[model samples]
Target chain A: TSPALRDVHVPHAYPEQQVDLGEITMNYAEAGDPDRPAVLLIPEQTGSWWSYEEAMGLLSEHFHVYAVDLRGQGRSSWTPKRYSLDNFGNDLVRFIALVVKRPVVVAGNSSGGVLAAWLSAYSMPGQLRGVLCEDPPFFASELVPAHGHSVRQGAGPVFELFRTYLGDQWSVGDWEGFCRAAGIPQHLQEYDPEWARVFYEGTVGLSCPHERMLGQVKTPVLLTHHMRGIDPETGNLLGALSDEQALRARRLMDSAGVTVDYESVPDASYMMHQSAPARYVEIFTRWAAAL
Target chain B: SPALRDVHVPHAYPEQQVDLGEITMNYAEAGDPDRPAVLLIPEQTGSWWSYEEAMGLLSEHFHVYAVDLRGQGRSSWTPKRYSLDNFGNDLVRFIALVVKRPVVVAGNSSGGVLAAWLSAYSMPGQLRGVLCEDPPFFASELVPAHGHSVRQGAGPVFELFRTYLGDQWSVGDWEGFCRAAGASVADGIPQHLQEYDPEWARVFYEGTVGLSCPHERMLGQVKTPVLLTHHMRGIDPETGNLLGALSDEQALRARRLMDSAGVTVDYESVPDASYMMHQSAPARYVEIFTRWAA
Candidate 1:
C-alpha cells in the first residue's frame, strides 16, 4: 500500500460516476435505461473502464451497461495492498447490490475475465445472470498452478519489473524510462503498477485458484479465447488461455452443470473489446440474447 | 532501410537487410565471400555493431558476418515475437538465403546460446562450429535444469530495463532510471544500450527468450563442434547469486552435456577476463576463433 492514497482523478469522455464501498471508492461509466436488463464491463488489468467505449455504446442499445474501474485502476481509489482477487470480486458484488440492483451479464477481459469467472462462481445467488470471460489467462497467471502454465512462463516477469521500477501506486512514474524499455501507448495513462506487483507476486490470486472458481460457476459462461503465441525454441507463452486451458475451462463449467460456451478467435487479440469491438459486441449479444 | 536503423546505427561496415517473410533480417559483412563464412550474433540487447571491431579483423582471415536478431537493432520489432526458436530460425535463413555456405557461428551472451542453438538445430551442413562467449545456458531460466534462476544473476539488470523503461520506452525517465542504474551508468547511457528495442530485455528476463532452448537439451543435440568460453564468473555465497553470465558448475554441466552427445567440446575458463570476450578483449576472441576454425 502507498504511504497515502492517491486521488481518483482519471478523467474520461463518458460522464463518470463514483460510489464509496466503505473500504474504497469505485469509479464507473454508465449508459442506456436502467430498467433494461443490466450488464457490467470490466477491462484487462491496468486497463480503465473507458476501454469499452465502443462496445459499451453498442450494448447499451439493448441493455443498461455499467463499466467500472477496479480499485487501483483509472479514476478508482488506488488502494495499495488491497489489490487481491477477493477484493476485486467482492467490490463488484457490492457494486451490483448498490448500483445495478439486479442480475446482470458481466463481461471481463484478461484478469477481468478471472473476476468475471469469480462472480459466476462466488457471487450470491441471483446476482449474476451470465459471465463473459474474454481471454482469461486461467492457470497461466498462477505463480505455481495446480493445473497448467505458471506465471513465470508468461507475463509474470514483466509485472515483476513494473513493481520494481515504479513501486506501489506509481511512486516512480518513470514514463520516459518505461518508454525506452518495453514501450506503450493507451491503457496505461491511468494504470496503477502496484496491481502489476501484486499480480506478479501472486498476491492477487492467493485465495482464488482457477479450478476452484470455475468449478463453482453458477451462471452460463461465454468464453472467447484470443490469439496465442509460443516461443518455438523455449515454449514460453503469450496471449490468453491456451487450447488445453481453454478446454479445461469449458470442462470445469460443464462439470458444474452449466453450459460454458467457448469460442476461440484465432485472430482476436488479448483485449477483445479494444482490438475487436464489433466482434466482441456481436458474440456477447448473441450469448446474452439466449439468456 | 528499416526505420529502426535510423541515427542509432553507425557506418562501420556496409549495412544490408534481407526479407525472410516473417521478418527482415539486418546485417553487416566484410572479407571475401570466397573465404570461409563466420556469423556473429550479439548479446540479447545488442546489435551487429557489437562485433564491428572484430568484424574487420576477423574478416581478414574469414568472411565475417554480424547480424541483428529480430526485435533488436534495425530488425522488425515483433511485439510478442521474441524467442530463441524465432531467432535461430532467422539466423538459419540468414545463412541459407545470404551466406549460402557452411559457416562458423560466434556469439556473446544470449547470442552465444543462439550460436549453440544453430549448432544443435540448424539446417544440415550449414554450421561448421560455434564460438560461445559466456552464454547463460541454464541460469537464464526462472527454474533451470541445472543452476540458479536468472533472478540471482543478470536478471536484476534486465529487470531494471523493463521497470524504468516500459515497453517501447513507455515508462522511462532518463535521470531517474539512470539513478536507479547507479554506478553502472557511472557517466551516462551506454551507446550499445540505445540502438535496439528494449522489449528484448523483457522477453529475456521472462524466459520467453530461452525457455524453449534448454542448455541440456540443446547442447546434447549438438551436431557441430563447440568452442565454449566461460568468462569471468563468480557466485555470491550468501545470496546464491551468480555475478556474471553463469556459475562454473553450470558451465561445466553445459560442456559435459555437449560432450555426452559425442560432439567435440573445447571448454575454456578465463576467470580473469571481462564480460564480452569479443567486445572487451576482441584480440583474444580473434586468436581463439582463428585457431579453432583452422
Candidate 2:
C-alpha cells in the first residue's frame, strides 16, 4: 500500500502527466507557457483534470494553465479514508509551492472553487494572485454553517447518489447498472466513491470555516453564481449554492478588501466553463488581465 | 440651516430628550399614560415627521411615542455610526428610558427593519408585538436572503441619493438633486428626507446596515406577534426595478419566516396605496394601526 491503488485512466484530447507529492501521485495536464503568469485549474468532485480541456488551450495563450486531479480522482492514487477538504487543500498548496513556484491565479469548479477560495485565504504569502470561485458551495457545504442552510438540506441527496452506486475507491462501481437507469453523469465514472461519502456525510469540509477563509482573502476574486432553485415540494436546493450563501461570501470578501466581482448567470448550469467555455475563458482572461 | 431641537416641531404632543449613554435621543409623545404604548420609528431618510401626522389619531387609542432616530431630524447625526444594529439599540433604550412599558412597535421602511430587529433581540416582555410596514426585509440588501437582488430592485435609487447628496450632506446640491429625483424618486424628496443625514443611504446601498444581522435568523428569532402590511409592490416595466417597499415574494418570505418561528403573523396588502401610508393617508394609517393594536 506504499503508493496506494491506481485507476486505468484512458487517453484524452490532451497530454496527461503525474507528479509525486510524497503522500499522493497527482495526475495532471499542463498547457500555456511556463514563463507566463501561472493558472491552476481544479475540477469539481468526480471530475478529472481534463474537465478543463476545452478551456486550457484558450487559457494557455495568456496563462501557463495547469489542471490537476487530486488524490481520489482520475489516474491519481486513491486514499479510501483520506478525502476531506483539508487533505485536498494541502495537496493543492503543495502543488502551487512545488510546481507553479510563483504567484498563481486559480479557478475551480464546484467544490474545486472552494479550493480556489481556500488558496485565496491560506496559501503561502504571495503564492496566490487571485481566484475565480465559479459556483463554490462556500458556507452551504458545512453541517450548520454560520451563514445559511447546510448542504444536508440542499444537494446532499445528489452527493448520496454518488456513494450509493459507486462505493469507496469505486468498489461499488455501477456504471453499467447506473447507465441503464439514467444518462450517466460523466465525472461520476472517474472518481472514488469515498470522495462523495465524505462530502455527503458532512465530514469533508469541517476544518475550513468559509467565513474566516473568505473574510481573510486579500486578493481580487470573481465569484460567479449559476442558476439556483429549490424543489417546490421538498424545498431542497437545486444548485451549487443559495443566493444568501453567495451574498455572505461576497460581503466577507468585500469586508476583507478582496475587491470581489459577483455575477449571477441566470438559469445557467453548475458547470460554467464546461457548458459555456468561450464566456468562461473570456471572463477569466479579462479578469486575470485586469490584475 | 441651524440645528433643529425636539423630536416634535410644535405639534399636539410634548417634545423631549433622554440620555441613552452615548447619545441623548429626542422623542415626542401623546396619549394617556395608562394606555398601551406604541413606538413609531421613521424610514432611513425620515424623522419623527414621517409618522408625526398619524400620532394624534393613534394616541387616542394608545400612548404614542415617535422619535427622531440618530442621523435624522433633530437627533444627533453620527457620521459613521449609522447601522441597523446601532439604530435598533437606540430603540431598545428609547423604550426602557422613555416608554418604560411593553410597547407595540410600528416602523416604516428602514424603521420597520429596526422593529423586526427589536422583536427578535428585545428582552422578553419588552415587546407586545411588531407592525412591520413597507420594510425592505431583504429587498434593500445588496445580496438578499429571499426575492430579487437589490441592484435589480432599488439599489439604483439608493445609489442616486448617495451620489447627489453624499454622506452627511457633504455634496449638498439640492436644486440639481431634486431635478434628478423627479425622474427617479417617486414624488421627489419628501419633507422627511430633507431633514435626514444622507450617510445612511451609503450604508443601505452598500448593504452594511444589516451586515451582522442577517434577516434569515433575525426573523426566525421573532417571538412576538407580527402584523406585516405590504404596501405597493411591482417591478418597473422597463427598468425591471422594484417600484415599491418590497416585491410580493419578499413580503411572503418575511411572513413565512415570522410565522414559522411560531408567532402569529398577520399580513395585509394595499397594492394601490402609497408605501408611506402614514404620510399620504394618515387616517387610513390610523385605522390600520388602531385595529391591529387593539
DockQ for each candidate?
A: 0.02, 0.05
RMSD (CA, angstroms), candidate 1: 19.0
For the second chain, the TM-scores of the candidates in order are 0.94, 0.93
Which is the leading candidate under DockQ?
Answer: 2
Query: Given the true complex, what DockQ would model 1 score?
Result: 0.02
**Of the candidates shown, which would achieve the greatest lDDT relative to the real structure?**
1
Off by over 4 Å in 2: A1-14, A17-48, A52-229, A233-237, A240-291, B2-12, B179-189
Predicted candidate 1 versus true structure: per-residue lDDT over B203-288, tens digit per residue: 77776776666667898999999998888888554333577788776777788789888999998888888768788888888888
Docking class of 2: incorrect
Alpha carbon lDDT at A205, candidate 2: 72
Q: Write the per-residue lDDT of candidate 2 for residues A80-170, one digit (tens) a residue.
A: 7788777888899888888778889999988899889888888878988899988888866765354544665565666676677667877
